[PDB]
Amino acid sequence: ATFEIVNRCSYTVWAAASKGDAALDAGGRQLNSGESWTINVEPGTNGGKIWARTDCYFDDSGSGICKTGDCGGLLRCKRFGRPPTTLAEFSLNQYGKDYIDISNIKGFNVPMDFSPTTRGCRGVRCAADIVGQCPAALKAPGGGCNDACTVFQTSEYCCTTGKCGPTEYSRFFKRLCPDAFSYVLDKPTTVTCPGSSNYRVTFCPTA
C-alpha cells in the first residue's frame, strides 16, 4: 500500500513510520514545508503508525534527537516515538479490510489528516490547535501537549486494567478533536476501508 506523507506545516517535520518492532519503508525522513514523501507499507501490516517529529537534529549517520516523537534517536525509525505524538494508526488486510484512525492517546504534537486516496471510505482528521489550547498540566516543556497517562502514570489514565473512564484531560482532547481517540476505551472512531486501500497523511491540513 502507498502512503503519501505531506507536510503542509510552515515548519519542517521528520516523518516516521513503524509497526513498533520494525520500520515501515525507510522508517523516517525529513519533510521541509510543502514536501511529500511516499512510502510503501507491506499488505497485512498490523498496528502500523505514522507520526511527525519536530525539532530534530541528526548527524551524518542518522543519529540524533527530536523534541517530539523521537524514536531512539534515529532518523530512520524502527520503534514508536516518544510522546507527545499525534498518531495516524492503521492495520491493513485484516480479514479483507483495512482499519484507520487518529489517536491522541499518546498526546498531540502536530495536526494531521489521514485519508484514503482510493475509494470506499472516508478520512479522519485532528486539526485543531491542541498545543495552543493545551491545559497547563499537560503542556510538554519539550514541546506539544502530553496525554495524561504520560504525565501522571495512573491506572485510570493509562487504562492499565482495562477498567477506565473518560477524564477531564481526555475530554479536552475529545472536545478539540471528536474524530480521534482520546483515551484507551474511547468510543471508537476507526474507519473501515476496502482491503489494500492507499492513503495520504497530511500534517497541518488546515494551515
Residue numbers in the entry: 1 to 207
Article sentences:
The final model of K137A thaumatin was determined at a slightly higher resolution of 1.01 Å. It consists of 3,309 protein atoms, including hydrogen atoms, 10 tartrate atoms, 18 glycerol atoms and 363 water molecules. Compared to K78A, K106A, and recombinant thaumatin, one tartrate molecule was reduced in K137A. The threshold values of K78A and K137A were 220 and 230 nM, respectively, and sweetness decreased by ~5-fold when compared to recombinant and plant thaumatin. In Lys137 of recombinant thaumatin, the B-factors of the main-chain and side-chain were 9.33 and 32.24 Å2, respectively. The normalized B-factor ratios of Ala137 were 1.00 for main-chain and 1.18 for side-chain, and those of Lys137 in recombinant thaumatin for main-chain and side-chain were 0.95 and 2.27, respectively. The normalized B-factor ratio decreased by 1.09 for side-chain, suggesting that the flexibility of the side-chain of Lys137 was substantially reduced. The reduction of flexibility at the interaction sites indeed seems to be consistent with the difference in sweetness, since the threshold value of K137A (230 nM) and K78A (220 nM) is higher than that of K106A (140 nM). The superposition between K137A and recombinant thaumatin showed no obvious differences in r.m.s.d. values except alternative side-chains and C-terminal Ala207 as with K78A and K106A. Three lysine residues (Lys78, Lys106, and Lys137) are still tightly interacting with the negatively charged residues on the sweet receptor, that is, NZ of Lys78 is 4.5 Å from CG of Asp433_T1R2, NZ of Lys137 is 5.0 Å from CB of Asp215_T1R3, and NZ of Lys106 interact with CG of Asp173_T1R2, suggesting all these tight interactions reflect a good complementarity.
